[PDB]
Symmetry: C2
Subunit: 131 residues, 2 copies
């Protein structure tokens, strides 16, 4: 007799609660290959924190990491951060979907949903086939 409560799942979202004591690891999907892909990192009020340039990447999934520091190398306090992945294809900028870890706080409500730390209630259609 079990649930997801306490487990980490992977969610199609641009926010995640980060414990900056540990490396943060996640991915994005890139539908066309590109010479220039990146993730801007913001704090929970929209202020830029850092920029992760991923350089050239092939179509498919791309993994990335954030060490929890701002672009000045100072450790950021644990909390909710925003990850905006994008790419430049033929001189135009496109958004990419990120897949980010979240803890399940509880299960709630025909319709079941996950209550995800920092996200509120999320539908299962956003959650990755659970590991």
């Amino acid at each position: 007799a079990s649930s997801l409560v306490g487990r980490k799942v992977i969610v199609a979202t641009d926010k995640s609660v980060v414990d900056t004591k540990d490396t943060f690891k996640a991915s994005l999907n890139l539908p066309v290959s590109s010479s220039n892909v990146w993730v801007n990192v913001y704090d929970d009020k929209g202020t830029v924190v850092n920029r992760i340039n991923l350089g050239q990447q092939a179509a498919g999934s791309v993994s990335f990491m954030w060490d929890g520091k701002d672009s000045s190398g100072n450790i950021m306090p644990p909390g909710t951060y925003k990850f905006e992945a994008q790419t430049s294809i033929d001189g135009k900028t496109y958004g990419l979907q990120t897949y980010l870890p979240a803890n399940v706080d509880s299960v709630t409500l025909g319709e079941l949903m996950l209550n995800l730390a920092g996200l509120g209630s999320i539908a299962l259609s956003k959650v990755q086939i659970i590991g």
Copy 2:
């Protein structure tokens, strides 16, 4: 380079099935349950089969369909619907299925989308971190 022609995993309830091959996919189950199932229907909503999965733990549950109706007759290749559900304390709840689809082309919204075989234009928030 393209993505075109690859197979991705989509939070959807429909998939183009080639019934000459076994069909394999997953659902997410948020709370463990003694009774989990997948109803299968043709593209007109006519019921084809019932895949009973019995008791399952919270997490990912994999399932397969051999392409046959409940009388053992091979169904024709085509779009099929997979409705995963469970029973929990006497109440029935839908579950999210994650099904394979072929990438026909890559296109714009909307603002990058996948045109998936049998599904149309689908947002990357519905697509599994691509293998």
